RNA sequence: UGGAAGUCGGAAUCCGCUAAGGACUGUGUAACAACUCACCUGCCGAAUGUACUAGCCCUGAAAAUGGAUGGCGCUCAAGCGU
RNA sequence: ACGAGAUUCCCACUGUCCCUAUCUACUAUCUAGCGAAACCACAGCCAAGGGAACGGGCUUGGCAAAAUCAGCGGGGAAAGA
RNA sequence: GGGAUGGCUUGUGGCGGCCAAGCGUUCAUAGCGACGUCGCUUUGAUCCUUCGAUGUCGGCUCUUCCUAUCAUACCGAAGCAGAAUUCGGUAAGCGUUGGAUUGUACCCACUAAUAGGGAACGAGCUGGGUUUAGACCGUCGUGAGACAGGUUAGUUUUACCCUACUGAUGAACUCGUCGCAAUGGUAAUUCAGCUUAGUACGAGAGGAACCGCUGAUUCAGAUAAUUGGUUUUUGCGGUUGUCCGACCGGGCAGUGCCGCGAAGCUACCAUCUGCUGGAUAAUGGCUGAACGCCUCUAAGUCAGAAUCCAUGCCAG
């Protein structure tokens, strides 16, 4: 197994989440929209439940545009079951639940009016929208943002208000013996570049989006496997090695990457009560 | 094969025809190989074998006095009630070695240029943080307390009882030190700190039950590793 | 058994590590990138490489899917660089191409395309078996 | 700190100092030991080093791969014209050593080996051995009688002093080489009846060493001049632009010592060394009388070992030569001292037996691929000079 | 092989069991070169009315 | 120490047979020859004794982050390993009986 | 692997040397001698019977 | 206890004949058997055994260029005590 | 869109490397002529001891033979240090 | 202007309570205490508890040393049947690799094995710690600016001196030839296959070893018959532009470019070669006292490791 799955994992990367845990009163875990179950850390979750019941824990779905709203509310409504939860698109220019997620943080500062600054930490997967959240929070680019994954790597403060301090962690994810490569991949921890053998992981990008998307996204129809599908997008555009032969590796990259950065439209469906 | 070959082996074709004879002159000249062992052998190899020697020779000795002797308490009077059984109110430790601040403190220089600021002090010793502490931020944090460094709970021992309980910790009382230790809760040796007695049963005289009470630290818990305490009862 | 061929002379060792030569046989790659050769010795900065009949250990970077997740065991068959056999004969071939074989020695495929080498075809006795032209 | 990933050292430390050697010819430094019950011989001889060439052998080697089949090996051609026997050294036990007691020289001596003791032989008066002609004569050699007695009497080992006959090699060289030659078994009063019935007589190489026997070699290596540490030691070249040189060890030292030491890869000197090889095989003896010296008895056809054109840089072989498998240190038209091996062999290999097939005679200045005038005249036809 | 030297010592006679017409042939030296040519080449049952 | 202590205690733990997994025959018969219960008492605290060495390890090492002397370094180091020792000593019956059931 | 300067190495190659090779050797070397013997074949005072004087130091100088 | 006879285990460990012999010190058997030890007697022939104390000597932990009672060298000392 | 801005990857490509080899010119080399400077307490082989964890001079040993040439970077020396 | 702990250390925890050989102690009968022991620190689970860089390490080339031995050699013990081993002993002679990962030390494979350190860490080169001057973001400050920090780009540049080392000459003894060997160095290493033998051993599955034979890994020393490489052989031929009026024969494009190319040099990219006596360590013994048994040791003595010393080998 290579390295690049094993990003994440890094004792640097869980020293400073575990430095952000400690500075801060309430944490916020971002999930994604897209799959919210699956970028939940539970492993946290139990540790804060354990160790340090005292800190606040809340959860924030972002990245709600690119999954249908109902969709969203049935999310929400099993988010809140467990804990208190908020809707997010974040967004500089335009933002969605900033007003409500800020009320929220004064509530927790008039509880904590004691001290003389409360500190919220975020957590989460890479790329779930952590920096762009504290980006929305501030009204300023901050926090610097990049849809690749791991661009935070050090804890940063930035003070929203004079009793409020945000602290940014770079994006973990918890060991886990079910956890496929694939799984990874698909919920957006490594970089695309950097994996061997591309196309294996675009049969599940395939079952995971209606073919119809796909068709309408890139214009192509009439692919009998992923193989073939992947040279006809290379054929159309434009994507030859030396010799006339398909660049199937460039274009499942260019597949993997628009299908984590949202340019195909994909979500995880809501269970059913 | 399968089940007692060996033994069977044995039985059907015996030994080696010398295997009784070289057994015995072996355990002849065991003498003079242990002899020689005791004068010849050097380093780490000569201490366990002196150590080890030294012990078996307690455990022999120890054999013949029982075997000899197979065919064969308080000054006052006391009745059976009163066996076992033991003003000033001295802590068992009232005097320990004073820590000095470099001891106590080592400095955390921040900056980027060549010429740094050491404003920072960490904490070297263990600590008790409190219950529900959340760390400063770091612009205004002097004094750091360390997670590894960190102890909720210690091993407290009876005195009467004679038994020890791991008990959570509740609260730093007196580090002889400095008054400033024990506003950080610094567990030193010698500390007085308040232990949930939960779990030992101590009650009042009509029936409330005790969960606080106090304890001093008899160990060095920066050298050891671990916290220990006695109960002062 | 380590697989390394016993009694096998001195030749020139022409494919080291990294090397990306063809699979002469129908198993379903198409060609095996070298991560290792067996019976490689120690010294410092060399890479391992292997002569035709060397079994070395491959990955396949174009074929069936399959077996693109397993380190197979390969032994080389063809290869570019020239050599000499005892008979004072210096020798090529056009390309570079081995088999897929189990560790034992016996192919998981069932026909080999082109000729294979007289040294791999007297070492593995199946490549000999599953060969239609020995060189 | 200790060194990360091991490594063994570049060169041997048994072959210092990398200078050149004292002189040009070989030294014997040991010779093998004598058994008087052993019949009298000869345990050393020299020879010019002519070329190389190819054969294809007939191995019969059980148990090896290429049994009962051929193999194309490398030999090394050896021209060895006869020597001749012109003195005879005694030598004496001693708690200092091996000491030289007296020298016995034959009463004619060739023009070969005075010029050996001359560095100007063609303003010199050639005056060299005419009294000692004499002693000879006066007295009916009383004074040889007296020194033979006295080897016979005092001494435990017995050296004739043989030369080569350089005349008959294409070398320009009119200075022949002279070296003494130990005689074993016998008593010594046998090596001393033996060295006096051979001297002024030449002595063959057939005589001395005989077909499928391994020997030793020992020459002076080819000269490379002041070679720096990368060829000389051959260590690892540093990375493109390295400063002060690439070609180069980058630490000399690092560690106490304050010093240079010794087992430093330094550059200098490079080849003309002294070299001992051992356990060489004779495959060939082949007589210089003989027009078919090179014609096994499977290629019939006709031809000396001499290669078309000579071979390069030296010439043709017109004496009896030595095929020796493999290669030996040294270079073309440079003396070569053949040994007999000092312990009794423990392979097979020396207890084989080799037939030859064939010898490659063509050409080495090209892409010869004819092995006589004949074949190539045959292969091409008619020319146009033949016509005119 | 076993009573003259072991594997790897006894050494086979391969014409041992040549059939031939004449038995003292079995062990002469086949000539394969004479005068740059192949005398394999020249082997013809027909030669002398040929010649 | 707690590389080798984990090293040996794996080989110990992964060689001997897992019940769970055998034929019923091999499992029953297992049983007769041998309390099952204690066979996989005695396996328990061989895998619990594992893990408590290397969660003392993992304290010690997190303390000799912070220590400050080679004195304190020195008592650290004989602390984790005689609290090793003692996980160890107190192992006496099962490793006898693991080795009389191998 | 056995070194080159092993006890039963040594054995080994020393009864091949008296067992194999020896006579060989004596048989190549008694044919060479006899080759060269064949080369070789074809008062006392003033008659050297009596071998007399040729025609820093071990003690001091006195 | 399937079997357990002193010798797989648990608990007791007595009496007689005694010169003396344990409800047994080990080997051994499936269990027995058999051997052996503790103990006693016969032969012998005069001094021993145990535990400590005080001397000298060995071990009682050592790394990394080649080296140090100052060096040679020293053994009824050229070492140690007077 | 634009960029001598910073980063990752793919194809091609090759002495970057496996693992080095060879050739050319100009040096370096030698000669005729011409001809400085930096630096310099005195000098330059090591080992152990020389309480101020310093030794090239001291002590105790190893030892030790004129005059030189080309390289060399361990030590000394050498960075407008 | 002033500066830039050390005959330390190693393999076995702390606290608290019992027990006890002993040390002390008889006008006081207290107190220490070896060897031990007892309490605190999941039915082979869990994988939903990674807990703070002020202190900096890496890497290339190359040499040597230590043993605290991973492998190879020998030996002792273990249900060690065989195979594979495990524990321990003597031993540093000989090896101990190739890679991936910087959102920042562990994985993978080959192999006999991928052992641990020192000579720095009490002015060689090159990546981080790391930090002159430019610039941006974050925190703090009214501010100049500072920093919890993060990012980008960024000037030290000997050798001809002495010594050491590597090589090369050399006066004096007339010149030269052939030698001896004090001393210094020293070299080989590991694996595989055939036979033994599908044999010993084994219920079966499986499955050795000595003698003998043949190769290969790493290292070392040479060599160029052959095969590749190299081309100022400017050797021959082809070809672009220009010039000598054209052809021929040539100049220039610093070797115009291309093809082949002897010779020379070269490459595990080619080929050849690498050798034997004595004394030992751990152990296994023989005879035999100490000590009327006994004992490999005391006197005497046999064997035995890749160890030690020499020969072979290089210098002289
Ligand atoms: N459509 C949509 N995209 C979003 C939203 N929020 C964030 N993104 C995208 O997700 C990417 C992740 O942004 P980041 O701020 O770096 O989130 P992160 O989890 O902190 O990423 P790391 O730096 O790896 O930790 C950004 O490049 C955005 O383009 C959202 O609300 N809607
Ligand atoms: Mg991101
Ligand atoms: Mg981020």
Redesign the interface.
């Given at each position: 197994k290579e390295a690049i799955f094993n990003k994440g994992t890094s004792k640097r990367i869980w020293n400073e989440l575990?430095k952000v845990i400690?500075?801060?009163?309430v944490i916020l875990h971002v999930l994604d929209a897209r799959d919210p179950l699956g970028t939940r850390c539970r492993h946290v979750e139990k540790y804060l439940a354990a160790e340090a019941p005292?800190?606040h824990l809340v959860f924030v779905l972002n990245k709600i545009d690119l999954v249908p709203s109902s969709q969203a509310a049935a999310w929400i409504r099993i988010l809140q079951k467990d804990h208190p939860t908020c809707a997010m698109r974040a967004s500089i220019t335009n933002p969605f639940g900033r007003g409500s997620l800020i009320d929220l943080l004064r509530q927790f500062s008039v509880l904590h009016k004691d001290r003389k600054?409360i500190?919220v930490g975020l957590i989460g997967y890479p790329n779930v929208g952590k920096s762009s959240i504290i980006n929305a929070l501030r009204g300023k680019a901050v926090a610097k943002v990049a849809p690749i994954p791991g661009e935070t790597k050090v804890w940063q403060?930035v003070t929203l208000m004079k009793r409020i301090?945000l602290i940014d962690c770079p994006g973990i994810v918890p060991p886990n013996q079910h956890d496929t490569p694939e799984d990874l991949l698909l919920r957006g921890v490594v970089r695309v570049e950097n994996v061997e053998?591309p196309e294996?992981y675009i049969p599940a990008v395939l079952r995971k989006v209606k073919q119809h998307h796909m068709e309408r996204t890139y214009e192509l129809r009439g692919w009998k496997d992923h193989i073939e599908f992947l040279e006809m997008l290379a054929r159309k555009s434009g994507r030859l090695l030396k010799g006339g032969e398909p660049d199937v590796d460039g274009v499942a990259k260019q597949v993997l990457n628009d299908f984590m950065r949202g340019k195909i439209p994909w979500f995880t469906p809501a269970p059913e009560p | 094969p399968q089940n007692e070959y060996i033994e069977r082996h044995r039985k059907l074709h015996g030994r080696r025809l010398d295997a009784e004879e070289r057994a015995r002159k072996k355990a002849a000249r065991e003498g003079h190989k242990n002899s020689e062992n005791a004068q010849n052998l050097r380093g780490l190899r000569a201490k366990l074998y002196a150590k080890q020697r030294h012990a078996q020779k307690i455990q022999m000795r120890k054999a013949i006095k029982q075997h000899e002797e197979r065919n064969v308490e308080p000054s006052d009077p006391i009745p059976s009630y009163l066996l076992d059984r033991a003003a000033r109110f001295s802590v068992p430790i009232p005097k320990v070695r004073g820590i000095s601040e470099e001891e106590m403190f080592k400095v955390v220089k921040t900056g980027k240029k060549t010429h740094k600021k050491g404003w920072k002090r960490i904490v070297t010793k263990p600590t008790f943080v409190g219950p529900d502490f959340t760390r400063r931020p770091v612009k205004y944090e002097r004094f750091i307390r360390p997670m590894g460094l960190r102890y909720k709970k210690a091993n407290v021992t009876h005195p009467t009882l004679n038994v020890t309980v791991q008990l959570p910790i509740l609260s730093v009382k007196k580090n002889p030190s400095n008054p400033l230790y024990t506003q950080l809760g610094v567990l030193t040796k010698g500390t007085i700190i308040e232990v949930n007695v939960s779990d030992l049963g101590i009650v009042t005289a009509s029936g409330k039950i005790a969960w606080g009470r106090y304890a001093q630290i008899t160990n060095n818990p920066e050298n050891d590793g671990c916290v220990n305490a006695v109960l002062l009862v | 058994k380590r697989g390394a061929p016993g009694g096998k002379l001195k030749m020139t060792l022409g494919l080291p590590v990294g090397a990306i030569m063809n699979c002469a046989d129908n198993s379903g790659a198409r060609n095996l990138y070298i991560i290792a050769v067996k019976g490689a010795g120690a010294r410092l900065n060399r890479l391992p490489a292997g002569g035709v009949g060397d079994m070395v250990m491959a990955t396949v970077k174009k074929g069936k899917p399959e077996l693109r997740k397993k380190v197979h065991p390969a032994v080389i068959v063809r290869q570019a660089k020239p050599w000499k056999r005892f008979d004072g004969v210096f020798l090529y071939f056009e390309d570079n191409a081995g088999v897929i074989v189990n560790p034992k020695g016996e192919m998981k495929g069932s026909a080999i395309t082109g000729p294979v080498g007289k040294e791999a075809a007297e070492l593995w006795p199946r490549i000999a078996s599953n060969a239609g032209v020995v060189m | 700190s200790h060194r990360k990933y091991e490594a063994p050292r570049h060169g041997s430390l048994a072959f210092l100092p990398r200078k050149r050697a004292a002189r040009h010819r070989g030294r014997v430094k040991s010779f093998p030991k004598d058994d008087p019950k052993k019949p009298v011989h000869l345990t050393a001889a020299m020879g010019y080093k002519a070329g190389m060439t190819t054969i294809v052998r007939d191995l019969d080697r059980p148990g090896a791969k290429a049994h009962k089949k051929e193999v194309v090996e490398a030999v090394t051609i050896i021209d060895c014209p006869p020597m001749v026997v012109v003195g005879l050294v005694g030598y004496i036990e001693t708690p200092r050593g091996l000491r030289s007691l007296t020298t016995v020289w034959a009463e004619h001596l060739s023009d070969e080996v005075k010029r050996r003791f001359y560095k100007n032989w063609y303003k010199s008066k050639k005056k060299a051995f005419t009294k000692y002609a004499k002693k000879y004569a006066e007295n009916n050699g009383a004074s040889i009688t007296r020194e033979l007695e006295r080897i016979k009497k005092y001494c435990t080992v017995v050296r004739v002093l043989a030369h080569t006959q350089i005349r008959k090699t294409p070398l320009k060289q009119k200075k022949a080489h002279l070296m003494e030659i130990q005689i074993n078994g016998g008593s010594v009063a046998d090596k001393v009846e033996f060295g006096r019935s051979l001297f002024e007589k030449p002595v063959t190489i057939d005589t001395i060493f005989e077909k499928d026997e391994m020997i030793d070699v020992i020459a002076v290596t080819k000269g490379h001049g002041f070679v720096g540490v990368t060829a000389r030691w051959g260590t690892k070249k540093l990375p493109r632009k390295t400063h002060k040189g690439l070609r180069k060890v980058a630490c000399i030292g690092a560690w106490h010592p304050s010093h240079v030491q010794w087992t430093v890869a330094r550059a200098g000197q490079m080849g003309y060394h002294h070299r001992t090889s051992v356990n060489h095989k004779i495959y060939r003896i082949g007589k210089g009388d003989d027009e078919a010296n090179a014609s096994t008895e499977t290629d019939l056809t006709k031809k000396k070992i001499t290669p078309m054109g000579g071979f390069v840089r030296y010439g043709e072989v017109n004496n009896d030569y030595v095929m020796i498998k493999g290669s030996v240190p040294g270079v073309k038209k440079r003396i070569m001292t053949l040994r007999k091996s000092l312990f009794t062999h423990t392979s097979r290999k020396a207890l084989e037996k080799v037939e030859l097939k064939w010898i490659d005679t063509s050409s080495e200045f090209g892409h010869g691929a004819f092995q006589t005038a004949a074949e190539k005249k045959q292969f091409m036809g008619t020319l146009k000079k033949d016509l005119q | 092989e076993e009573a003259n030297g072991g594997a790897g010592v006894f050494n086979v006679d391969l014409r041992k069991d040549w059939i031939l017409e004449n038995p003292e042939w079995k062990y002469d030296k086949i000539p394969e070169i004479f005068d740059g040519k192949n005398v394999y080449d020249y082997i013809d049952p027909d030669i002398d009315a040929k010649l | 120490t707690q590389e080798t202590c984990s090293e040996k205690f794996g080989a110990i733990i992964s060689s001997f047979p897992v019940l769970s997994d055998q034929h019923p025959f091999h499992r029953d018969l297992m049983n007769i020859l041998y309390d099952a219960d204690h066979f996989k008492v005695a396996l328990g605290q061989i895998s619990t004794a594992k893990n408590l060495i290397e969660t003392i390890s993992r304290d010690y090492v997190r303390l000799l982050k912070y220590a400050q002397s080679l004195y304190q370094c020195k008592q650290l180091k004989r602390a984790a390993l005689g609290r090793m020792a003692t996980l160890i000593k107190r192992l006496k019956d099962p490793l006898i009986y693991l080795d009389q059931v191998r | 692997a056995k070194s080159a300067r092993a006890s039963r190495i040594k054995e080994n190659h020393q009864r091949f040397k008296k067992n194999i090779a020896g006579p060989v050797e004596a048989a190549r070397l008694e044919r060479l001698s006899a080759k060269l013997m064949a080369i070789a074949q074809a008062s006392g005072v003033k008659s050297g019977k009596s071998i007399g004087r040729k025609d820093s130091s071990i003690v001091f100088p006195m």
């Open positions: 575990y400690d500075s801060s009163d005292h800190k600054q500190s403060y301090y053998h294996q | - | - | - | - | - | -």
